[PDB]
Amino acid sequence: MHTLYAPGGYDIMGYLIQIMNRPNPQVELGPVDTSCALILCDLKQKDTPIVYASEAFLYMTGYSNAEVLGRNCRFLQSPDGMVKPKSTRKYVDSNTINTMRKAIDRNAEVQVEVVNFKKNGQRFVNFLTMIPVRDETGEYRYSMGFQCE
Numbered sequence: 001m002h003t004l005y006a007p008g009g010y011d012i013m014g015y016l017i018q019i020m021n022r023p024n025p026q027v028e029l030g031p032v033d034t035s036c037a038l039i040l041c042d043l044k045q046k047d048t049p050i051v052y053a054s055e056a057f058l059y060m061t062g063y064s065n066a067e068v069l070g071r072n073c074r075f076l077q078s079p080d081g082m083v084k085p086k087s088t089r090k091y092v093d094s095n096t097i098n099t100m101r102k103a104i105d106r107n108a109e110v111q112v113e114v115v116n117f118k119k120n121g122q123r124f125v126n127f128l129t130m131i132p133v134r135d136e137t138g139e140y141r142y143s144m145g146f147q148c149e
């Protein structure tokens with residue numbers, strides 16, 4: 001993967017406001033900001049790569065900025081951060097992860113509890129919410145994830 005990052009960074013704050021102000025609310029998650037664990041992935045690049053990770057996310061997972069950026073977030077699904085696309089996971093609910101894949105595919109809001117692993121191998125239940133985000137074009141370009149231990 002050779003994910004390319006937006007020169008000048010991402011409008012994370014504008015996105016947080018966009019989400020809190022959405023008229024549709026399938027999933028209600030209340031007020032949110034940059035102090036929590038969040039990540040932004042690019043739906044328009046190969047394998048939906050992470051293009052931004054908040055400091056809380058890095059801390060929570062134990063990974064560094066350079067170890068997460070450019071990767072699909074599924075790596076958290078294994079204690080060694082090793083997971084092949086479409087492979088059958090040995091510690092995660094197959095139904096759960098397919099719910100995520102299909103939600104993302106349809107730009108549909110979704111919330112799940114999924115087993116993940118910190119860089120040091122520590123297991124945890126990740127209370128995950130994923131919401132599609134429109135860029136200045138007006139259509140869905142990214143997805144913002146909110147992770148909760």
Ligand SMILES: Cc1cc2nc3c(=O)[nH]c(=O)nc-3n(C[C@H](O)[C@H](O)[C@H](O)COP(=O)(O)OP(=O)(O)OC[C@H]3O[C@@H](n4cnc5c(N)ncnc54)[C@H](O)[C@@H]3O)c2cc1C
Nearest residue numbers: 041073074076085086087088089094098100101143144145
């Ligand atoms: C903004 C954002 C944040 C995210 N944050 C996290 C995070 O913190 N932690 C995390 O773990 N993930 C996270 N994800 C999810 C991850 O990046 C993938 O999107 C998710 O795992 C689903 O896609 P996949 O490519 O892994 O699916 P696949 O690799 O295709 O795997 C699907 C699995 O489901 C089963 N399956 C698939 N289809 C069917 C079917 N039709 N019937 C029965 N079984 C089936 C299979 O056995 C397979 O193993 C995030 C995604 C986004 C967009």
